[PDB]
């Protein structure tokens, strides 16, 4: 009874970071050997658990959160980080107990002329609670004057496209990120 991990890491497309996908894993036999013993993962960083010790423990739920970000924004996927992704798109709790796996996916998610299917939130009145997301597309209100739904000054659209291109530098090249949280 193997785990759906094949349908997460080897998924066709990943959700945008502002609407990151979450999948629940339970009542399953998890094989973390296939993950750690794979060179495809540029970033494989675990907090609170050891990658080799992972197979020796059992948890009641494993949450796999999948999304796509930039290379420079991978650092923000860590407990106690500040940035666009951490503050407005995906916030991890400080007491994080889980792993983060990010690998470069330029030859999947970057396309000629810009990939505009991937978006991230630019603004929000308050930072996100950990493991909380909002898919709201309402026109961000930056100042006092009511927007009334007219984009313009202090009425900014909250979502911006990454515009992934295959000729970008490694920093801006897309990275697919899967966050495993154990409870």
């Amino acid at each position, epitope marked *: 009874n193997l785990c759906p991990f094949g349908e997460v890491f080897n998924a066709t497309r990943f959700a945008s970071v502002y609407a990151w996908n979450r999948k629940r894993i339970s009542n399953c036999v998890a094989d973390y050997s296939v993950l750690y013993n794979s060179a495809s993962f540029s970033t494989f960083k675990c907090y609170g658990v050891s990658p080799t010790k992972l197979n020796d423990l059992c948890f009641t739920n494993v949450y796999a959160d999948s999304f796509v970000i930039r290379g420079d924004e991978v650092r923000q996927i860590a407990p106690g980080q500040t940035g666009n992704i951490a503050d407005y798109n995906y916030k991890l709790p400080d007491d994080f107990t889980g792993c983060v796996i990010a690998w470069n996916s330029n030859n999947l998610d970057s396309k000629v002329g810009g990939n505009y299917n991937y978006l991230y939130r630019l603004f*929000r009145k308050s930072n996100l609670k950990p493991f909380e997301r909002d898919i709201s597309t309402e026109i961000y209100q*930056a*100042g006092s*004057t009511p927007c009334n739904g*007219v984009k*313009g*000054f*202090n009425c*900014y659209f909250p979502l911006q496209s990454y515009g992934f291109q295959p000729t970008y530098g490694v920093g801006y090249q897309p990275y697919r990120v899967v966050v495993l949280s154990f409870e």
Partner: antibody
Amino acid sequence: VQLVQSGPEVKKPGTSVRVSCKASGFTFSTSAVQWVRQARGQRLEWIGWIAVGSGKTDYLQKFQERVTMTRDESTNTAYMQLSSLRSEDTAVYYCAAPHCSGGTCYDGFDIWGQGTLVTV
Amino acid sequence: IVLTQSPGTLSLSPGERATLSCRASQSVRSGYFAWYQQRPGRAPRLLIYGASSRATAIPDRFSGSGSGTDFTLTINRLEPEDFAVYYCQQYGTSPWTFGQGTKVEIK
């Protein structure tokens, strides 16, 4: 909070000027930078504006093809690239940005950089 | 929108009220109209917002009332310190347009 422009960029006709405004104190990710122009002894002439967050630039139709505007958010600045300079563009250029500290902009373009005199 | 400033040039003395009436062609989107003061050499400084809400650090001698097309700026104790060119602006969905400046003149 403050905003300082480039220096004078006296050039020859047909050249291109890259005027830079550098901002301090803001949460510049939410700010907007409008670019305006004023000849000597004349009235202000709007050029365009930049939404720094989305990086979305709106130009005046007269300047639509000639001029472009960019941000480079890493350095918290704002750049105006003006193409071939006709003799009319002998004017002082100004940036304007609002109090956008703490992810909440303050209505009105209060903060203004000292102008840069560009001669054609 | 093509704005204008009716009073032209103010040939006043630093004792009486200065009225700066600004008239647009269309209306403006809510409180997006704004007033600016530009001293003869200085960069313009922002005074007023949509209707009356003055900017921070603006001395109380500066006030203004107006909505829709019509707008007005009032100066009660006109001062030698207050002798500049005052500009209109609108932040509407149209390309934002200033107004022809009004110079306040002494005596």
